[PDB]
Design a protein around this ligand. Structure first.
Ligand SMILES: OC[C@H]1O[C@H](O[C@@H]2[C@@H](O)[C@H](O)O[C@H](CO)[C@@H]2O)[C@H](O)[C@@H](O)[C@H]1O
Ligand SMILES: [K+]
Lengths: 205, 218
């Protein structure tokens, strides 16, 4: 089985550096070209770097978006490929995947998340969403002005937790809602934000 | 660089029907080796992309014969026969004839299901939030299909523009519906300028629009 495992992702400030690593098994590493591809909502999939093999003198190829700031390298003694990223910008945010090439980009790792922001870690402000439509009653919690992702919301059956939106401020916001048949209506939302060491239980009347 | 144009962004299909995705390149993809390095990827929800078809028409290991690729030069098509739930995801076209290697914007293959009207709710800002100097007003649309819905905010007898943000869930794995939040964010000052807050929803499943409102301070 082909196995690709990326690591090294995380949170960094604009202008700073970060090195990603990939470790591969299941093909003769030294015989195949390796690539990094990233994914963001705004740009979709973007191939960013390739490194070839001994017969190509380990030549490197880059998208214009990263040439000269990013460096791809490989260690054939460790079946490892690296991406050294310099002068990171908010536009570099996304999921970074390691790939090998035989037919195309034949297998991809799970990916490593890179987040680029000058925002300080901040725990959410949690506000109740308090009151029927097609028999249903809805209540929820607004989880406002936190950084970074993620939050987890739990309730003490019709739960929707919306994708976070990044605000002008650089802080995220989302709502988590409970839909119950009105006749089946003390609701408490438990909001966990690991990065800020914050846990809020909020009563919704 | 070579721009890959795929259509549509979102493609509804009924289970067991045929789906067809189109991709165009801005440059011929015939390589000097005489091969056409045009490929398709599938990305299922929460997963990495997987190679589906390479060199126009060759199914990758484990890809069933329901998937059929065709085309030449700059114009390509993927045909998926007898669509199954395992086929739903985002399909990407790609070229690797020319460096830089490039991708289309993706086509979400979505389950086409019967129309479902949203259940709609409005939530005033909490007394706690207003003590912080901001007012978040939330409109909630639950369990609708298709994804298109018009959410219009109304303050008193009139309309709002450019101060709201929508967030939409992924198509639900069990009921194949969407849910949506629309959040109107105002300073406390701007919130206290008006008495009546309303969100009006227009959707295929509603014979007429549904309005949910509150009076500030009720
Ligand atoms: O040359 C374009 C071609 O590159 C990749 O295939 C190469 C193959 O040409 C070379 O001989 O061997 C290397 C080994 O890693 C790759 O298999 C792409 O996979 C192919 O789609 C095409 O873009
Ligand atoms: K209608």
């Amino acid at each position: 089985e082909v196995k690709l495992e990326e690591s090294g992702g995380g949170l960094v400030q604009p202008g700073r550096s970060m090195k990603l690593s990939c470790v591969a098994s299941g093909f003769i590493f030294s015989d195949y070209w390796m690539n990094w591809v990233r994914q963001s909502p705004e740009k979709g999939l973007e191939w960013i770097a390739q490194i070839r093999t001994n017969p190509y003198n380990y030549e490197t190829y880059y998208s214009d978006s990263v040439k000269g700031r990013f460096t791809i390298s490989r260690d054939d003694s460790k079946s490892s490929v690296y991406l050294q990223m310099k002068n990171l910008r908010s536009e570099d945010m996304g999921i970074y995947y390691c790939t090998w090439s035989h037919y195309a980009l034949d297998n991809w790792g799970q990916g490593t998340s890179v987040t680029v922001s000058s925002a300080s870690t901040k725990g959410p402000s949690v506000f109740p969403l308090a009151p029927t439509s097609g028999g249903t009653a809805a209540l929820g919690c607004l989880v406002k002005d936190y950084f970074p992702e993620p939050v987890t919301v739990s309730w003490n059956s019709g739960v929707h937790t919306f994708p976070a939106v990044l605000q002008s401020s650089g802080l995220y916001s989302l709502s988590s809602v409970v839909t119950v048949p009105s006749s089946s209506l003390t609701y408490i939302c438990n909001v966990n934000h690991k990065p800020s060491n914050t846990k809020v239980d909020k009563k919704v009347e | 660089d070579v721009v890959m144009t795929q259509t549509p962004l979102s493609l509804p299909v009924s289970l067991g029907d045929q789906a067809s995705i189109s991709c165009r390149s801005s440059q011929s993809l015939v390589h000097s080796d005489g091969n056409t390095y045009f490929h398709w990827y599938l990305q299922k929800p929460g997963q990495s992309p997987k190679l589906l078809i390479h060199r126009i028409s060759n199914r990758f290991s484990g890809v069933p014969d329901r998937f059929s690729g065709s085309g030449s030069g700059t114009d390509f098509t993927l045909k998926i026969s007898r669509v199954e739930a395992e086929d739903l995801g985002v399909y990407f076209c790609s070229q690797s004839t020319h460096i830089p290697w490039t991708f289309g914007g993706g086509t979400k293959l979505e389950l086409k299901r019967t129309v479902a009207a949203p259940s709609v709710f409005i939530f005033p800002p909490s007394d706690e939030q207003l003590k912080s100097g901001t007012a978040s007003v939330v409109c909630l649309l639950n369990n609708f299909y298709p994804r298109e819905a018009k959410v219009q905010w109304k303050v008193d007898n009139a309309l709002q523009s450019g101060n709201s943000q929508e967030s939409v869930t992924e198509q639900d794995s069990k009921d194949s519906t969407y849910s949506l939040s629309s959040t109107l964010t105002l300073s406390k000052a701007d919130y206290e300028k008006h008495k009546v807050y309303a969100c009006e929803v227009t959707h295929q499943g509603l014979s007429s629009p549904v309005t949910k409102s509150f009076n500030r301070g009720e």
